[PDB]
Ligand binder design. Structure first.
Ligand SMILES: N#Cc1cnn2c(Nc3ccc4c(c3)CC(=O)N4)cc(Cl)nc12
Ligand SMILES: N#Cc1cnn2c(Nc3ccc4c(c3)CC(=O)N4)cc(Cl)nc12
Ligand SMILES: [Cl-]
Ligand SMILES: [Cl-]
Lengths: 123, 4, 123, 4
């Protein structure tokens, strides 16, 4: 018999992104080649099958630094990290291949789906 | 607020 | 020029609630009289003006235990904590006064609003 | 997915 506040989940995510911008309570650095990205492990796990697996691991759960595969593109990661915290995906002709490869590695199925659909439409 |  | 995934914020919040149920990466215990509630500081701050103030404080940000005012009702807190993690508010005739008082203390303005409207309709 |  609950009532539901429609905008609550969006409001929570907006405040999680504000915490990220101010670097408040971030507990991990994701290293992608020469670039570093600070984030909250809980948000990464909530958005990515890869981070969900990493941070449920009894040893990796305690690491403050995670190094991604050297084939991962930093811009593609940056775009996906912004998506995680905002629901908005900056998908462009110039970045779609990197975004799709990064989303496959991160196991972000909905992003992979749409990248596939956008690529199919251009061929 | 809504009835979900 | 971003695209947006409508269900993303709800999906994130669902996974944050799953982490809470499994006690994964919870970093605080909220003590309300004889009861204890484990939570994620980032979610508490994102939902509550009181926790936002507490966890931005340079000393309180590092505490693993937060004790609420002894006038706070544990059930009212439990209902609001569930709301934080789900967008669903279990508002009943038997708990509305406790929920509203707890929401005022926690500075959860949208919950206070609706409690006020539900009370006004019954008088 | 939508145009926000
Ligand atoms: N507890 C917990 C918890 C935290 N996170 N999380 C999941 N995170 C996840 C796992 C796989 C995938 C995605 C997110 C997006 C995607 O495409 N695949 C799943 C579950 Cl079943 N549980 C949890
Ligand atoms: N950074 C950050 C950040 C984390 N959380 N958070 C806010 N959390 C908040 C503050 C006040 C109120 C509510 C939530 C619900 C309500 O009724 N009042 C606000 C801002 Cl402006 N910023 C942040
Ligand atoms: Cl996704
Ligand atoms: Cl609220």
């Amino acid at each position: 018999s609950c009532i539901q506040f429609t905008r609550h989940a969006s409001d929570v995510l907006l405040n999680l992104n504000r915490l990220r911008s101010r670097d408040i309570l971030t507990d991990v650095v994701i290293v992608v080649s020469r670039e570093q990205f600070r984030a909250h492990k809980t948000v990464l796990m909530a958005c990515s099958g890869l981070f969900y697996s990493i941070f449920t691991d009894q040893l990796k759960c305690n690491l403050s630094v995670i190094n991604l595969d050297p084939e991962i593109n930093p811009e593609g990661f940056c775009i996906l990290l912004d998506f995680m915290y905002t629901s908005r995906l900056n998908l462009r002709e110039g970045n779609i291949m990197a975004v799709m490869a990064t989303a496959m590695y991160l196991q972000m199925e909905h992003v992979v789906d749409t990248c596939r659909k956008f690529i199919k439409a251009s061929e | 607020w809504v009835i979900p």
